[PDB]
Design a protein around this nucleic acid. Structure first.
Ligand code: ATP
Ligand code: ATP
Ligand code: ATP
Ligand code: MG
Ligand code: MG
Ligand code: MG
Lengths: 32, 321, 33, 321, 32, 320
DNA sequence: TTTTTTTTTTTTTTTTTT
């Protein structure tokens, strides 16, 4: 039942050598 | 489908299979459909090894003939995903058809992306109500993907909003090369989990600007042909429905006055020939919209009326009438 | 007289060494799966 | 035709015929038409044996001259497949000719696939009503074959839908190499049962993407020529009618403006010279289409109008007029 | 003077040993 | 000159029969045969070969001749009528017998229609540009339609029954079969009077039979033998030879002077073998354009001709 | 010393009258 989140995590490092947990996705300026 | 690991027969080892996967081949059907030239381009693959792979794949996937009677029975069991509108489904004869490419074109605000958002949820509901019981993959080349629409639509169909959002994979393409390269990663997720729909919105958004002038027209169309060919292969291997959107431009010349529509889709002859079913969109009165079947191998030319609401695409209501 | 289906069987057998009763065309996602 | 088993004379053993069958030769005509160089690559075929094969085959298959009167008598007995449209039947002088390659090209939704579907049914109806009393073989490269259409058309001509769908062999091609390989399988089928039509739809779809760039143009054209030559040999061996559809491209170099049509078909000079008859399809008004003979050795350059209906291709009706 | 049909018949006989009266050209699926 | 006239000075019928089986059917063929080929066939010794060459030279001219006499002989050449006055004036009378004429161009430009027209006009009397001889048609594409002949034959007054009975048709399935058919053609032309040879087309089979760059040397060498055989047919019998050819697009854009991006297939072997070459282009409707690309004596020019139901003819005012 | 081949491919609106 590999969750999609973990499956996407495996695919990103397989293809891009990117730590997804550290390099997230930004839509713009955020209040954080 | 058939896993590529089943080719581990008669002198095929991990190194041979692993080399194939890194080149973009993730299923047995991928090896069989691949021409001999492409396999020879992979390093570490010899002519003797390449010919052995084709023979083994052919014994596993159907590469021969069949009677048209059997093919009729196979197509009668095909899954068609509902579009949320009875009028749209009746015109399409069941809904969007899996294993084929469906193209939607029209002006802005006509409802191309709203239909795609509806399809991203109807692909998860059970088959008894016209669903697909599989995940969706959404590729956006404009930044117009809005998960808020999915939440409202999922509430209409009774799905859990958290589960609905967790079964959709979203990726954004920034250039033509990046858009094509995203398909290779998409193929890998196909081989490890059950998906049921591919959405590209839109296709020609980045090809329009990345290639400039008539000098790059030949290169632009050749690259587009490769992209659409790869989309066709995904439908062949896994059976996922392919839905693509497109934009339109005005016809400056008035010679083609016999056509009441003064706008034509962007993509040239490659885009027109590659799609299996083409649907045109126009804006009606209020929230209502018009859909027209332009080209289809088995659907007569006809029109229907649908409407856009908060909970996705649905049939027009008497209040709007 | 030999039916066309039967004629398909041997030809697939001869060229691809495959049993058409085991492998069949699949054109998408089937309701029976 | 002449069965290959008739060559088992004067020292020709069982293995000699079996080796020839494995090499793609299934009729005494095929070996007679095969060049002496081609017969030399078969293992176990000697210098003396090849000459003996050619001499014996030539004894059963005519290679000499014939008076134009006798050839005229034979051509008057030719079976022409009806197209289902009186206007189109008159344009082609009886219908689709057997023993020659007919090429249909045009834009999309122009009825090329609809015409092929109708011919797949009309090749089984009796001779007196324009049929051929045979089976159809439908090779498809785009995935747009629908047995649903055959059910509707077979009802119009008085055929049983189950029997109509049981006499049409179907096979899909996935690359250029697979497309050419399917012809050898067809020849074996055709030597054991009566076929009257073979359809490839379409030809240049796979060649467009398998060969990329100007550096592979020479390789692409020569591979295509091999495929077309193989198709012609099937017509000579068995006498069946070959129908191949083609796509179209919009010419951009506006150096010439004499031709009002800004669209030309894919294939170059290899496709232009190979086809015996070429027909151009255009869209008219509504469900009407325009057909025009482009190249034919014995037909004047005319034009006719035909319409597509749910029961097949037919003459335009007064409702549309 | 020899008719063309007989002249053709002898040429086929002396070059292929083919009885031109029994082995004939066929162009396609005939109506007989 | 019949080959049977060599039955003198010790040459018997056995030697002549061997010559006939080796492809030599006329005294000219023996005379033009190089000494190597005569020794290749069995049954003939060096003394016999020398005797044959000496005897053949006695009946066939081999010495010198003044240009005045040669001009006088060529003024009596028979030019087959093409059916169109525009082409007849362009070529100085039409297709000349005894020499190779080549036609090339894009499809539906009327190359095969002209060959069908010539196949009928070679049987009408000499007073109207005919040849009063039969025709031979070798087709390598399977596009020979006798229905065209009947329509054309009615225009010229010929009986359709006789027109179809004076035309011999053969189909070539491979390059080897195509070359061997000329050997059978020689025997037929040695028994009855022929006036036209048509090959349609030449390079159709050579394009596919020899595949790849490694076989280009073999492909061009086989083609040379076919043209040498064709020239020998014109020398022995005087029959006109009309051959058609396809065209190929020159992808290399280095040169741009020529408005035509298409060139004939064959290479320099084809270009140097053909005495006369004509280029065909499409005009308005039934009209076409013919241009004399190469000719030893005709100037480079152009004309317009039209394809009609009764054959090839001059364009009418309706097309104008 | 010899001896050429072979086509691709669409873009994209403007602007009141009294
Ligand atoms: N939450 C909503 N409730 C109701 N109608 C909405 C809502 N969101 C969008 N719409 C309607 O949908 C329209 C947008 O349509 P859509 O985004 O599908 O267009 P599109 O054809 O994909 O256009 P584009 O070329 O901009 O990508 C809006 O103009 C509006 O009429
Ligand atoms: N059942 C039907 N009843 C009536 N008309 C139909 C039916 N099915 C299809 N059509 C018509 O035929 C058209 C499809 O034409 P078709 O698929 O034969 O064209 P094509 O030239 O082969 O296309 P492509 O380039 O996509 O292969 C539809 O757009 C419609 O007008
Ligand atoms: N009976 C006829 N009446 C009028 N025009 C005709 C007739 N038959 C053929 N044509 C014309 O001749 C054309 C065919 O030309 P032709 O057969 O000479 O071709 P070609 O130049 O040899 O080309 P290819 O062999 O490459 O196809 C047709 O397209 C048509 O325009
Ligand atoms: Mg959108
Ligand atoms: Mg089609
Ligand atoms: Mg021709």
């Amino acid at each position: 039942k590999k969750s999609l989140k973990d499956l996407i995590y495996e695919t990103n490092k397989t293809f891009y050598q990117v730590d997804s947990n550290k390099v997230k996705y930004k839509v713009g300026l955020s209040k954080k | 489908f058939v896993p590529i690991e089943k080719l581990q027969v008669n002198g095929i080892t991990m190194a041979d299979v692993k080399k194939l996967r890194e080149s973009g081949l993730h299923t047995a059907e991928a090896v069989a459909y691949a021409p001999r030239k492409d396999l020879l381009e992979i390093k570490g693959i010899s002519e003797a090894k390449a010919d052995k792979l084709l023979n083994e794949a052919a014994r596993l996937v159907p590469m021969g003939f069949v009677t048209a009677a059997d093919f009729h029975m196979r197509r009668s069991e095909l899954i068609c995903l509902t579009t949320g509108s009875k009028n749209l489904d009746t015109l399409l004869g069941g809904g969007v058809e899996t294993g084929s490419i469906t193209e939607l074109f029209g002006e802005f605000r006509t409802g191309k992306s709203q239909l795609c958002h509806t399809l991203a949820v109807t692909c998860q509901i059970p088959l008894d109500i016209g669903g697909g019981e599989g995940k969706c993959l959404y590729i956006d080349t404009e930044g117009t993907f809005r998960p808020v629409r999915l939440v409202s639509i999922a509430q209409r169909f009774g799905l859990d909003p958290d589960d609905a959002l967790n079964n959709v994979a979203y990726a954004r393409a920034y250039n033509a090369d990046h858009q094509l390269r995203l398909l290779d990663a998409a193929a890998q997720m196909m081989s490890e989990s059950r998906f049921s729909l591919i959405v590209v919105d839109s296709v020609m958004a980045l090809y329009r600007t990345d290639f400039s002038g008539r000098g790059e027209l030949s290169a632009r169309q050749m690259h587009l042909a490769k992209f659409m060919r790869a989309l066709q292969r995904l439908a062949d291997q896994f059976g996922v429905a392919v839905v693509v959107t497109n934009q339109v431009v005005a016809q400056v010349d008035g010679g083609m006055a016999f056509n009441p529509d003064p706008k034509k889709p962007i993509g040239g002859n490659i885009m027109a020939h590659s799609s299996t079913t083409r649907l045109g969109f126009k804006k009606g009165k209020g929230c209502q919209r018009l859909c027209k079947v332009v080209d289809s191998p088995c659907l007569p030319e006809a029109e229907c009326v649908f409407a856009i609401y908060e909970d996705g695409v649905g049939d027009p209501r008497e209040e709007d009438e």
